[PDB]
Amino acid sequence: YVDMVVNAATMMDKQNGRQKIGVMRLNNTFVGDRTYNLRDQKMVIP
Amino acid sequence: YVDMVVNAATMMDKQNGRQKIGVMRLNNTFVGDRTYNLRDQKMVIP
Amino acid sequence: YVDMVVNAATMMDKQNGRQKIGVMRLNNTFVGDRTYNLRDQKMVIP
Amino acid sequence: TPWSGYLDDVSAKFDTGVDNLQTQVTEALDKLAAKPSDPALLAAYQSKLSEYNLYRNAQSNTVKVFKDIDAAIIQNFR
Amino acid sequence: TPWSGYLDDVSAKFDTGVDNLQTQVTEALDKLAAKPSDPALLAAYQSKLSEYNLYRNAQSNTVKVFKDIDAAIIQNFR
Amino acid sequence: TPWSGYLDDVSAKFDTGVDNLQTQVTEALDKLAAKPSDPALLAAYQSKLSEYNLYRNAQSNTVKVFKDIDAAIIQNFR
Amino acid sequence: TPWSGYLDDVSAKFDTGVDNLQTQVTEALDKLAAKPSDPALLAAYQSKLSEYNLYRNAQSNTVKVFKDIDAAIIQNFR
Amino acid sequence: NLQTQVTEALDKLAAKPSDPALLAAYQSKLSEYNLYRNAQSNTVKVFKDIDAAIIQNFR
Amino acid sequence: NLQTQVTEALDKLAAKPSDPALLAAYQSKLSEYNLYRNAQSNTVKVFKDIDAAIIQNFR
Amino acid sequence: NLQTQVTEALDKLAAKPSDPALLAAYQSKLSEYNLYRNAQSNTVKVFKDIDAAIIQNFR
Amino acid sequence: TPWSGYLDDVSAKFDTGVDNLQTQVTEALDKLAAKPSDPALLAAYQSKLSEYNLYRNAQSNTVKVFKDIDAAIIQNFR
Amino acid sequence: NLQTQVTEALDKLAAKPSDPALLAAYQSKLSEYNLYRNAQSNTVKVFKDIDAAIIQNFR
Amino acid sequence: TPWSGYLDDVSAKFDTGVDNLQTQVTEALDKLAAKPSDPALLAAYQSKLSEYNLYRNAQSNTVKVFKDIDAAIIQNFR
Amino acid sequence: NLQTQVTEALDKLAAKPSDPALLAAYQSKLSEYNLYRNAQSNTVKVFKDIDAAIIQNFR
Amino acid sequence: GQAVNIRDRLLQAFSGSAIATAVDKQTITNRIEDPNLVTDPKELAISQEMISDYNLYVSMVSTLTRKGVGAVETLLRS
Amino acid sequence: GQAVNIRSMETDIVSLDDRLLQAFSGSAIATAVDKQTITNRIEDPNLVTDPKELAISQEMISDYNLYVSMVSTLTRKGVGAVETLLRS
Amino acid sequence: GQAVNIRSMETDIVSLDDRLLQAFSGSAIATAVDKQTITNRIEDPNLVTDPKELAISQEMISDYNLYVSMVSTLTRKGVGAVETLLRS
Amino acid sequence: ALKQNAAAGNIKIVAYPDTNSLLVKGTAEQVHFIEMLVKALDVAKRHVELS
Structure with a gap:
């Protein structure tokens, strides 16, 4: 009885994928980087 | 009694993380580095 | 009694810092290095 | 403290030999x-x-020499 | 417990002898x-x-020297 | 997984460090x-x-430097 | 059966750590x-x-350090 | 258990x-x-060889 | 049959x-x-060396 | 005490x-x-071997 | 007394053989x-x-020549 | 006296x-x-090994 | 009598091959x-x-070739 | 006589x-x-070794 | 999936040591006929132990039989 | 930390065999610990790396190897002298 | 500054037993000093780093090997000549 | 003793102008320690008027 319980306990420890695409539509802002050419300094908005 | 207690204590010490994003809206200061073109020296406030 | 005390002392000696940020507001001087365009010499005070 | 080697310290000696010439060129x-x-x-x-x-030209060629001095000796370790 | 040898400690002295050069290369x-x-x-x-x-060159040449010392001794076991 | 070495990721940082320079040279x-x-x-x-x-000259010369560092280590394998 | 060894383990360990370099140099x-x-x-x-x-040198010089040790065992056979 | 952290790096x-x-x-x-590894090979080897020498003496 | 799949490359x-x-x-x-190849030659050799030692002992 | 002035440079x-x-x-x-280091290892090595030669001679 | 060998004395002979090379690089x-x-x-x-x-190149090359001669002799002890 | 004109140049x-x-x-x-120097090292070497072979032969 | 070897004699052929070239560079x-x-x-x-x-380049390279010839036979002594 | 036209150019x-x-x-x-030159040195070496190997077997 | 199973005194001793020396012969025969087991170093080490204990075992019962029968002749000649 | 044992124990002997038996026991206790402490020096793999503790572990082989070889051949000659005399 | 002694004294032997004691005692001092010579050659670390002194220490090792090996086999063949005569 | 085994070079100080402040970092006493330095580093300076 001892040799079965020990050997069948260490064999559940040794025992113990698809990607997917999501499309999300924004509602209050554009996408992509914008530039503001205020001609004093190149300000960037990522 | 002794061979059980020593063996079952040195097998508990031999048995012994998710990042996350936070969004913080400021209230008293802009974000990002600003530049002050005071035309004597290019001063920057980080 | 002697073999117990020696073997317990040499098993205790084998078993034997957090950073933190402080914000200090100054009161009598600006911060950062300055440059003095006094047109005799671009003088700097670190 | 930002660590600084000897090769950092040789290029800094050119940097301290002029006081604020990098500032003075931009101001001019x-x-x-x-x-x-x-x-x-x-x-x-x-x-x-x-x-x-x-x-800048005198600074950059001199540091390159001290690189070549160290690399010839370290190659002669083994 | 993760084991660390003697060869780890000589190479660790290069890692601790410089403060944050691994950061400084990334920062530069x-x-x-x-x-x-x-x-x-x-x-x-x-x-x-x-x-x-x-x-890295100073790290790798030093370990090679201490490697050749032990293998001459281990051959001189028998 | 598209494999990327360490030298691939440093050179990609130059590509992202400029916003649209590959477009702007052709467009200008x-x-x-x-x-x-x-x-x-x-x-x-x-x-x-x-x-x-x-x-491109600073990018391509930089990978050449990191190439000679690894080859000195790889020669010191055996 | 097409048999694999421990030296075939480490060589193909290089071939699964990299993904497409045997062909990514072909598309460029x-x-x-x-x-x-x-x-x-x-x-x-x-x-x-x-x-x-x-x-390719890493998959090669690993072989030489992993051969002669198994030579040293068989040298200790008699 | 040294061979474990060899096979993981x-x-x-x-x-x-x-x-x-x-x-x-x-x-x-x-x-x-x-x-x-060769140290282990060389150290068992002398322990075999000197063990072979006793039977070499009494034979 | 190891020498076969050697001789095919x-x-x-x-x-x-x-x-x-x-x-x-x-x-x-x-x-x-x-x-x-040398492992197999050296391992049959011990099986050769020790049987002659017995007849050297019993002679 | 040579290993001391090894460890200081x-x-x-x-x-x-x-x-x-x-x-x-x-x-x-x-x-x-x-x-x-190899000088100490090589010089002790002959003294084991020549001491083993005497017992190989007298056996 | 801190020990200095003969190979140290050969390299020390280069240090005394030149008068002020450590000073002349720093002052110039x-x-x-x-x-x-x-x-x-x-x-x-x-x-x-x-x-x-x-x-320094002559110094580092000089220790390497006297080392391999000695290494040829030490192998020929036993 | 070869080491003299070694140590003079x-x-x-x-x-x-x-x-x-x-x-x-x-x-x-x-x-x-x-x-x-290694020539002198190599020439003493043949004189030791062949002299060790004689006592190896007669033992 | 101050001794002179074969490598001295090969370099002496350079010494006799030029008449007064050490003088001629200084006078020019x-x-x-x-x-x-x-x-x-x-x-x-x-x-x-x-x-x-x-x-000097033809002189210095010639002694190096005859050195490696000599080292292969002496290695083949024992 | 190759060394002559070595010593002549x-x-x-x-x-x-x-x-x-x-x-x-x-x-x-x-x-x-x-x-x-190295061809002659390497070829006498095997001829020394093979002449030494037979007497090495019978010694 | 890996598996495991669990399970006159001279007349049992010679028969007991009959297959006791036979199975260690066969287990090192297919240890070396299997080419996967001869490439790993730590499998060579446990077979190196397995060769060495084979020599000491059958030699001990050889000579002790020899000394066992070496004690019988002298008493019978007396 | 370190720890040494200052007290060595001793027993009276009355006969000749126990004087032989304490050399027999004295040799068995030397080889049983010295076969193991150098392996503990080998199995601890930081001890097989430093050249300082490599050179003492180099010479500890020779201390173990020459000692057991001496007591073998002395006993081989020692039992050899009793063999020839009773055969005569 | 080094030193040599020039007197090799002679005491009379009264027997062969008195003769053998000089050859052993004259050799036991000599076999102790040369092994102690080569260690102090080694233990002085400034002696082992010079090229000229290495061939001197190379010579003194190989003479030590050839000396004690030559006295071992003669005593082995000497006592071997005894065993055959007593067996006859 | 191990918290008194902090490196002096592990001190990192940055200026921050828009609140006229310094940001320092370290273990629990050296942030208090260099506070004593900076409290004795800005005194109110005095005016001198020329004629």
Whole structure:
């Protein structure tokens, strides 16, 4: 009885994928980087 | 009694993380580095 | 009694810092290095 | 504390030998861009820019030599 | 317990002998890649790349010497 | 997984460090080739060509440095 | 059966750590030799050929350190 | 259990045989496992050889 | 039958002794074939050496 | 006590791995320590072997 | 007494064989870094650096020759 | 007395390590002292091994 | 009698192959250094300095080849 | 008699170390004497070893 | 999936040591006929133990039989 | 930390065999610990790396190897002298 | 500054037993000093780093090997001549 | 003793102008320690008027 319980306990420890695409539509802002050419300094908005 | 207690204590010490994003809206200061073109020296406030 | 005390002392000696940020507001001087365009010499005070 | 080696310290000696010449070239440039037709300002900027060209060129070739001194000896370890 | 040998401690002395050069190489690349036209950034970057080159070379040649000492002794066991 | 070495990721940081320089050199050329006699367009194209020349030369020479560092280590395997 | 060894383990361990370098250098030789002047393609393959040189010496010099130790065992057979 | 942490560090060098920090630690690892294995081979060998010498004497 | 699948890789390098992938796989074969041949010769040798010692003892 | 003055020059190279004069003195030290260690190993080696030759002779 | 071997004494002989090479590199650099546009200082600094370049290379090469001779002798002890 | 004219040419190069005629002459000396010493090392070696073989033969 | 080897005799063939070339470089430098703007003195000095460069390079490389020949036989003694 | 025409081309190059045709024949000469000398040393060595191996078996 | 199973004194001793020496012969025969087991180093070490204990075992019962029968002749000749 | 044992124990002997048996027991206690402590020096793999503790572990082999070889051949000759005399 | 002694004294033997004691005692001092000579050659670390002194220490090792090996086999063949005569 | 085994070089100080402040970092006493330095580093300066 001892040799079965020990050997069948260490064999559940040794025992113990698809990607997917999501499309999300924004509602209050554009996408992509914008530039503001205020001609004093190149300000960037990522 | 002794061979059980020593063996079952040195097998508990031999048995012994998710990042996350936070969004913080400021209230008293802009974000990002600003530049002050005071035309004597290019001063920057980080 | 002697073999117990020696073997317990040499098993205790084998078993034997957090950073933190402080914000200090100054009161009598600006911060950062300055440059003095006094047109005799671009003088700097670190 | 940001660590600084000996090769860092040789290039810093050129940096401390001039006090704020990197500032002085930009400041002489800032007065020039407002009115780029004054010969007294052009001759001042020609002197400081030519001083700044030899500053960086003399700095970068000397550090390259000390790299080659160390690399020839370290190669002779094994 | 993760084991660490004697050869780890000699190589660890290079790791602890310099403070944050692994950070400093990473820090020098981000300031250069943001604006790869600043002469103040160019002279600093020549020094740090050459410092990291001598860093790894000094590490690897030292371990090779101590490696050859032990193998001559282990052969001299029997 | 598209494999990327360490040298691939450093060179990608140069590509992302400039916003649209691969587009802008070809695009500034297209505005220049329609009318290659506008001084406002000539001074703009002089800036982008010299920036793209210094961009690729500093990028390609940097990978060459990291190449010689690894080969000194790989030779010290055996 | 097509049999694998422990030395075949470590060599194919290199072939699964890398993913497409045995063919990623083939798409850039089709690409760069098509127009042999593009700067985004010249530096593309130089990031591909260089990593091809470190990976093939790493899969090679691992073999020599892993052979002679098994020679040292069989030398200790008699 | 030294061979365990040998067999866990080669794969990141397999996935990245261009990281300068990793192969430096890998060489300090892999040469150290090389010195251990032949040491074990040489140390059992003398313990066999001197054990073979006693039966060589009494035969 | 190990020598068979050794002797099947020499011919493709014979037609092309410049392929980088083939000689990488071939070195993994030939050094492994080096480990097989002398191990078998030395291991039969102990089985040879110890039976003669018995008759040297009993004579 | 030679290993002491071995262990005092590597750390200064650890703190400064770009001084040309210091690593020159360090190279002259550690290679000289390379000559000492195999000297002690090779010289004890003959004294085991010649002492084993006597018992090989007298057996 | 801190021990110094014969190979130390050979390398120490180079240190006493040159009079002030450690001083001459530092003093010529400090006068040059104060004003890096003097042709009298440029020709003086080129001279002082090249003497230090051949000095250390001759030092490091000298210890390697006497080492492999000794290593050939130590193998021939037993 | 070969070591004498070994130890006499380093000093003029020590006082002047930029003369082109001397280091060429210095190299012609030092490689020959390199060639002489191991020759002496190799020649004592044959005289030990063949002398050890005689007592190995008669034992 | 001061002893001279075979490597001395090969270098002596260079020594006898040039008559007074160690003198001729110094004398040509002395006429040029008195007036370094004379085309007759410049053209004489370019020839004599460059001949001494090929003289020593051919001299120094020849002793190195005969050294490796000698080391293979002495290694093949025992 | 190869060493004669070895010893006959260096001296004419010594008097004129800038003739392009002469050092080309000299390089074809001087590298060839390097290939001859080590060939004789390596070939006597096996002939010493194979002559020593038979008496090594019967000793 | 890996598996495991669990399960006159001279007349049992010679029969007991009959197959006791036979199975260690066969288990090292297919240890070496399996080429996967001869490439790993730590499998060579446990087979190196397995060769060495084979020699000491059957030699101990050899000589002790020899000394066992060596004690019988002298008493019978008396 | 370190720890040494200052007290050595001793027993009276009355006969000749126990004087032989304490050399027999004294040799068995030396080899049983010295076969193991150098392996503990081998199995601890930091002890197989430093050249300082490598050179003492180099010579500890020779201390173990020459000692057991001496007591073998002395006993081989010692039992050999009793063999020949009773055969005569 | 080094030193040599020039007197090799002679005491009379009264027997062969008195003769053998000089040859052993004259050799036991000599075999102790040379092994102690080569260690102090080694233990002085400035002696083992010079090229000229290495061939001196190379010579003194190989003479020590050839000396004690030559006295071992003669005594082995000497006592071997005894065993055959007593067996006859 | 191990918290008194902090490196002096592990001190990192940055300026921050838009609140006229310093940001320092370290273990629990050296942030208090260099506070004593900066509290004795800005005194109110005095005016001098020329004629």
